[PDB]
Amino acid sequence: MEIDKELAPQDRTVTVATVLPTVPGPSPFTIKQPFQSEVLFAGTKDAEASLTIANIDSVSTLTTFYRHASLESLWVTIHPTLQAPAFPTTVGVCWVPAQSPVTPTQITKTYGGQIFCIGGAIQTLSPLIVKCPLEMMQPRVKDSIQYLDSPKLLISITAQPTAPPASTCIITVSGTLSMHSPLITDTST
Amino acid sequence: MEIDKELAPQDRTVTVATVLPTVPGPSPFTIKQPFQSEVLFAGTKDAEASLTIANIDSVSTLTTFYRHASLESLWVTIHPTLQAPAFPTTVGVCWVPAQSPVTPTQITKTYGGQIFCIGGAIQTLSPLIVKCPLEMMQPRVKDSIQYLDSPKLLISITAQPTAPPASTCIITVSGTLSMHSPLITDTST
Amino acid sequence: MEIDKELAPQDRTVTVATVLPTVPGPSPFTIKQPFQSEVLFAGTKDAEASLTIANIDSVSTLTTFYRHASLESLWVTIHPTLQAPAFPTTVGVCWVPAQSPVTPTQITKTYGGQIFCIGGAIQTLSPLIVKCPLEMMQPRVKDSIQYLDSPKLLISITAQPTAPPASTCIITVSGTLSMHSPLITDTST
Amino acid sequence: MEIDKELAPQDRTVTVATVLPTVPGPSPFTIKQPFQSEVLFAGTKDAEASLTIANIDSVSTLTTFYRHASLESLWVTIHPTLQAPAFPTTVGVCWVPAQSPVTPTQITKTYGGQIFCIGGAIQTLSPLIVKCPLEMMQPRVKDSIQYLDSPKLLISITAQPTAPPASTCIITVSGTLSMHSPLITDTST
Amino acid sequence: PSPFTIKQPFQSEVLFAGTKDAEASLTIANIDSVSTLTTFYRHASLESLWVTIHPTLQAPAFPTTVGVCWVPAQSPVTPTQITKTYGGQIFCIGGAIQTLSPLIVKCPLEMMQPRVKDSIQYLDSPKLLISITAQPTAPPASTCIITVSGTLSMHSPLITDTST
Amino acid sequence: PSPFTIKQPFQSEVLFAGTKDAEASLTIANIDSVSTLTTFYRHASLESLWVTIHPTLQAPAFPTTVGVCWVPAQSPVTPTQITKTYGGQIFCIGGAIQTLSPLIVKCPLEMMQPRVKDSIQYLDSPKLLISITAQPTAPPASTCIITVSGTLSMHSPLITDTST
Secondary structure: OOOOOEEOOOOOOOOOOOOOOOOOOOOOOEEEEEEEEEEEEEOOOOEEEEEEHHHOHHHHHHHOOEEEEEEEEEEEEEEEOOOOOOOOEEEEEEEEEOOOOOOHHHHHHEOOOEEEEEOOOOOOOOOEEEEOOHHHOOOEEEOOOOOOOOEEEEEEEEOOOOOOOOOOEEEEEEEEEEEEEEOOOOOOO | OEEOOEEOOOOOOOOOOOOOOOOOOOOOOEEEEEEEEEEEEEOOOOEEEEEEHHHOHHHHHHHOOEEEEEEEEEEEEEEEOOOOOOOOEEEEEEEEEOOOOOOHHHHHHOOOOEEEEEOOOOOOOOOEEEEOOHHHOOOEEEOOOOOOOOEEEEEEEEOOOOOOOOOOEEEEEEEEEEEEEEOOOOOOO | OEEOOEEOOOOOOOOOOOOOOOOOOOOOOEEEEEEEEEEEEEOOOOEEEEEEHHHOHHHHHHHOOEEEEEEEEEEEEEEEOOOOOOOOEEEEEEEEEOOOOOOHHHHHHOOOOEEEEEOOOOOOOOOEEEEOOHHHOOOEEEOOOOOOOOEEEEEEEEOOOOOOOOOOEEEEEEEEEEEEEEOOOOOOO | OEEOOEEOOOOOOOOOOOOOOOOOOOOOOEEEEEEEEEEEEEOOOOEEEEEEHHHOHHHHHHHOOEEEEEEEEEEEEEEEOOOOOOOOEEEEEEEEEOOOOOOHHHHHHOOOOEEEEEOOOOOOOOOEEEEOOHHHOOOEEEOOOOOOOOEEEEEEEEOOOOOOOOOOEEEEEEEEEEEEEEOOOOOOO | OOOOOEEEEEEEEEEEEOOOOEEEEEEHHHOHHHHHHHHHEEEEEEEEEEEEEEEOOHHHHOOEEEEEEEEEOOOOOOHHHHHHOOOOEEEEEOOOOOOOOOOEEEOOHHHOOOEEEOOOOOOOOEEEEEEEEOOOOOOOOOOEEEEEEEEEEEEEEOOOEOOO | OOOOOEEEEEEEEEEEEOOOOEEEEEEHHHOHHHHHHHHHEEEEEEEEEEEEEEEOOHHHHOOEEEEEEEEEOOOOOOHHHHHHOOOOEEEEEOOOOOOOOOOEEEOOHHHOOOEEEOOOOOOOOEEEEEEEEOOOOOOOOOOEEEEEEEEEEEEEEOOOOOOO
C-alpha cells in the first residue's frame, strides 16, 4: 500500500563521541518524552537556519527538572504546503555535530549534505524525512557537563524569484529523548 | 516506503588497473575521510566538464597530507533545483579513466555514456546518482607514482534556449578516501 | 529503490541461424570489447533509419585485426532530451535480421515491432531500452564468411507538426562483442 | 526495474468450444508463425470495428497455404502516439466469439467489455494490452469446417471534439499461429 | 568496536624573539599547526611534544635571555615565574654556547591532558610559557625563532566543508 | 629467485655557503655522487641519509644563519618555510657554538620513498631544503660546506658503456 511519507536518509560514515559514563551505583529510573519543534516556515524568501537541537524550547523544557537526558531518535520533516505546487522551492538539509563550523551556505560542500526541490513536478509533495544519525553524533543533550558535538541542524532555503504569497513548506524537527536523575530545585513553579 | 534517490548505474565491463605494494613491514595507521564536492551549477547555459577526480577541491585538500590515498567509494549526484520543473535540462554523464581521450561531447560514443532529461513538471525530481565503478578504474588518487587511469568525470549540459534565471540543478561528487603514510609539509595553514 | 531505466523488450519467437563451426584444432584466446554507437538525433522532423549493426564504425574498427567476432549482448537506448517534455515524439523500434526486407514504415505490421510516445506525459522521460534478441538472430558479425541474418535495427520517428528547435531524443545502440584469431595484415597504422 | 507495458485483462468465465480431430494416423509436420497486424489508426474521429480475427491481413495471408490453423496466443495492443498527451481518447475494447451479436456500441453491456481513457499529460502512455482469452473462444481460424466462435474484436473510439491533427494511438493485434497440412494453390505470388 | 586513528607531526612557528622584551602564554591546542590538522576530526591526542629554539646569526652579536616552561593549561603560572616552577628553565642565546642541538625542551605529557580536541572541553591541556629579555641596545632583526613540534593522534571525522 | 645487491656509501658536496643569501631545493636522486654510483644499476634504494654542515674558519668572523629540512620530493614546501615544517630546523654557524660533531640532520626515510632508481619514476623520493642568510657585510670566502651523505642499496645491472 501507499504511505504519504517520502524519506531521504543522509550519506554516513563512522564517527564516535566520547560520553561520560555514570558513577558506580544504582540505576535510576528513566522515562522517555517525545516532541515536535517548529523549525521554519519557508518558501517566501531565501533564508537559512542552523541550530543546536539540544537548545530548543521543546527540549529545554522537557528536561527542566532532570540532570541527564540523551536523544533516543531524531529527525526533521519537510511538510509541503498548498503553495508548494504553484511555487517549487529548493531546500537544503544537513545533520552535523555542534562543533562543525559549517554554515548552511556550504551544505553542498559538506559530506552528508542534501538538496531537494519541493513541489512543481510529479511526486514532490509527500512530506520529507531525514533521520538524524545519532550513530555519528553526540546523543547527550543534558549531562553533568556540556558536550560540543550534540546534533546541529542546517537548513537552506532558495525561494522563487517571483515569490509565493506564503510559506510553501513547514519544517519541523521531531524525536524523543530519555531522561533520569531529578534536579533538586524549587518546584513551586 | 519511498526513498528520494534514483540510480542510473553505468553499463560496465572487466578492465583493471595495476598498483604497487607499500614497502614490506607493519601495516601503517590509516584513516578514512568522506566528502562531497561542488562540481557544477548547471542549467543556465550549455557547458562541459572533464574532471580528473584526483584533483578536485575536496580531494586534493584532504590528501594534502598523505603520500598514499585510495578511493573506497565514489559517485556523482545530480540534485535538481527549484528551476528544474520549469526548465528541463539535458545532462550527460560518464565515468572514465583519466587517460581516456574522450571529451564530454563524445559521451554518447563511449560505452558507459549516459544522458538524461532533468526537469519538467512531467518527470521526477529525485536526485539522480551514478556510483562510479572503480573496479573499472584506478582507485589510487595519490601514490608514490603517477597512475594514468585515476577516475575522470565527464559532464555535458544542454540548456533551455529561453534559459532559466538560475541553475536548474547542482552536481556534487561524494566519496570516501583511505589515506595513509603522512607527507611532510606546511601545517601552518 | 528507483532506477532511471525503463525497458520494453520485444515480443519474440523461436528462430535460429546456421553458423559456421570452427575447424578442429586449438581454441584461440578470446577477448571482449564493448561500445556505444550514435544512431540518431531525432525529434526535429519525421525521419527513419535502418541499419545492419554488423557494419557500423564502432564495430568495424574494434574488429579490424581479428578474423572472427560475435555479439555477446546488444540493445538500443532512447535517451530523452530536454525538449522531450515540451515536444512529445513518436518513436518506432524493431530488431530484425539483415535479410528481412521490412522498412521502418512497416514496423507496426511486423511482429516484434514497437511504438512509444516520448515525453509530454507522466513517466515518459526515463531512457528506454530494447534488448536485441540475438537468441533469434545471427550473432556473428565477422567470420570466415559473411552472413545475411546479422542484426538490423529499424527506427521510425514521427515528429510534432509544430516541431522542436532541437532533437527531443538521442538514440544510441550499445553492446559488447567477443573476438579472436588475429588477421595477419600491415600493423604499421 | 520498470517495463513499458500495461495490462487490462478481460474479466472472464468458463465457456468452451468444440473442434474435430485431424484424420487418424501420423502427426503432421506443423509450423508456428507470429504476426502483428495494423488494426486501427484512431484518435481523429469516433469509429467502430467488428473484426473477425480469422480474416485480417496478417492472418488470412499467413494461413493462405494451409487447411488447418489454430491460434496459440492472441492479443491487442494500444500504442499511444505523440498526440496522445495533448488529446485524451476513449478507447473501448472487447474480445468476443465471432457469433456473438454485439456491436462496439454495446461493449459496456457485455461481460468482458472494457473502456479506457488514453492520453492527457495526467495518465501514463505505456502501451496497453488485452491478451485474448482463447479458452473462452474458438482458436481454430481455419479448419475443414466453418467454426462460428472464432475470435472477434470489438473496438470503440470516442475522439476529442476539437480533434487532433493525427491519430493519437495505434491498435495492433499480435499472435502466433499453428498451421499444418498444406492447401494447394497458386504459389506464383 | 575499534578506533582507526592516524598520527600526524608538525612544527609551529610561535615566536620570533630578540627584538624587545616579551612574554607569552600559549594554549597548545590553539596554535595554527594544530587547529589546522585537527580541523577534520572529532578527537585528537598528543603523542609527543616539545619546544625548539632555532637561533639566528643575530644571536652572537646580541645575546638573549630566553626562558620557557611547559605547564597544564589551568596552572596559574605567569612567564615571570618560570624559574619558580618545575618544568621551567632559562637559556642564554649568544656569543657563547648556542645550538648544540637547537635546544629543545620536551613537554612531559605524563603530567597533563594530551587530548586537544574531544566531545568536551578539557582545562589541563598543554600550555607553553615564554619569557624574553633582550639587549637594551636592541638588535636589528629577531635573535631566534621559537617553534614547538610534536605529533598528533586523531580519529573520527568531523563532517565539514572539505572544499579547502 | 633472489636479489644479490651491494651497498655503497658516499658524501656529496652540495653547497658552499656563507658568501651571499641563498636558497636550494635538492632532489637527492639527482646529486652527482648518486647519479654516479647508480649509473650501472636498474634499482637503488637508500638505506641511510643525512646532511652535514662542515664549518670553515670564516665562521667565527662571520656568523651565518643556516636552515635545512628533509622532505619528500612532492612536498610543496619552499626553503623559506623551513621552520613551519616538521623535519626542519635552523642553525647559527659562528663566533659562538660551531662543530660539536659538524651538525648533521638525519633524514627520516621512514617518511619517504628510499627508492631513487627503479623500473619507474617515483615522486616522493628525498628532497633537501636549504636556506642561507649571510652577514650583510659579507665574508671573503665560504663560511661552511654542506654535504649530504648516506649509503645506497643497488642491484640488477644496467647494461651500458662500461668504458668509463
